[PDB]
């Protein structure tokens, strides 16, 4: 317990961003103890890939990059290597060689309301798919042929939609907060 990584500042953040404008916090110089989080009843998704799946119950010194965002329940499966879809393509992309953990949990109680929480957004149109860990927070009208235009107009679109999160809909349309952990091993020797 010599300087464990303060994960609670990430997972218990009062406000989470929209998946198109996903945010990263780096937690520096601490022993990743994500094994304590796996133990929790708290998480509906918990998938570690590569070396994070082998060192899952291990304790080691690293920098942790935490990517936070909200998605629909049906969209949570897109936060995985090799996946395609509007979130995977145009919002948040993991590399095929991803070696970290994906954590998600149902946030119906805080991210949905009786009349619909519409504060969270995703992008549905883009010219090309995102590279892994690329981020696009632009709001420029989209057209198939890439010529400038103002909506409303034939073949001219605004690229952002809202999630509509209600307390009446099933888990698939309910809100999920998602945290992606990337671990960066700290080396000792001098430069």
């Amino acid at each position, epitope marked *: 317990i010599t300087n464990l990584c303060p994960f609670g500042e990430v997972f218990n953040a009062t406000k989470f961003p929209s998946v198109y404008a996903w945010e990263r916090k780096k937690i520096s110089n601490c022993v990743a103890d994500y094994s304590v989080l796996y133990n929790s009843t708290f998480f509906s998704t918990f998938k570690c890939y590569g070396v994070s799946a082998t060192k899952l119950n291990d304790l080691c010194f690293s920098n942790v990059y935490a990517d936070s965002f909200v998605v629909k329940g049906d969209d949570v499966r897109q936060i995985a290597p090799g996946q395609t879809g509007v979130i995977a393509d145009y919002n948040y992309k993991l590399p095929d060689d991803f070696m970290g953990c994906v954590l998600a949990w149902n946030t119906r109680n805080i991210d949905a309301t*009786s*009349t*619909g929480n*519409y504060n969270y957004k995703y992008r*549905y*149109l883009r010219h090309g798919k995102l590279r892994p860990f690329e981020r696009d927070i632009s709001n420029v009208p989209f057209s198939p042929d890439g010529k400038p235009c103002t*909506p*409303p*107009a*034939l*073949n*001219c*679109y*605004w690229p*952002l*939609n*809202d999630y*509509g*999160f*209600y*307390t*009446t*809909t*099933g*888990i*698939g*349309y309910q809100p999920y907060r998602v945290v992606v952990l990337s671990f960066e091993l700290l080396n000792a020797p001098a430069t």
Partner: single-chain antibody
Amino acid sequence: EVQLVQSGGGVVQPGKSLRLSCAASGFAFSSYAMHWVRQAPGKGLEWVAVISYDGSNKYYADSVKGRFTISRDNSKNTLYLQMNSLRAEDTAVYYCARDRSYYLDYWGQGTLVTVSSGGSETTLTQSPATLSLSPGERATLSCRASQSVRSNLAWYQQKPGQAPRPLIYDASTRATGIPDRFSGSGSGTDFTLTISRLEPEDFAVYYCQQRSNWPPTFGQGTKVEVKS
């Protein structure tokens, strides 16, 4: 294929009661919210009520609040509406509809309810009222909302006397099965639906709907009719 078969229409007198049924098949009924929407004779669609997937949450338009009770039986895959103390204002074709987070992606056939013997909502303004075109021509329909709905607009196609059918969700995304000659555009208050290369089956009434500002509302429609 998702199927919703309604029953229990008929004519009643004012102050009387009726129950509408909607039997669901071809999907996991218990996972979806279910809505009631109604259409008064020769007019636009109005949102009535919604029940949650598990039947514990229920919400009603102000107009029918306190005398319409929505319910469901998840073993029977059936949705109900108990319509008590009916007025002339309630005369409508009633529709059950599967929830797509307050867009409506599958609709029952409709049941007419005639109550006749006595006896800050977001407004969606569609223009023109009618649009008279020939096959192969381009229809451009407009829907100006009173307040911003961002991109939270859907469009529906209604053939005469038949249930509405979703065309577009979220301003610009087509519903399943909808060919690419239909296209929608806009965010905020100014929205268009373009039907290019009009086909014989495209002649119908078209309804825009907002879901984000409570309660869900529909425009009064644009009739795309064959040019006489």
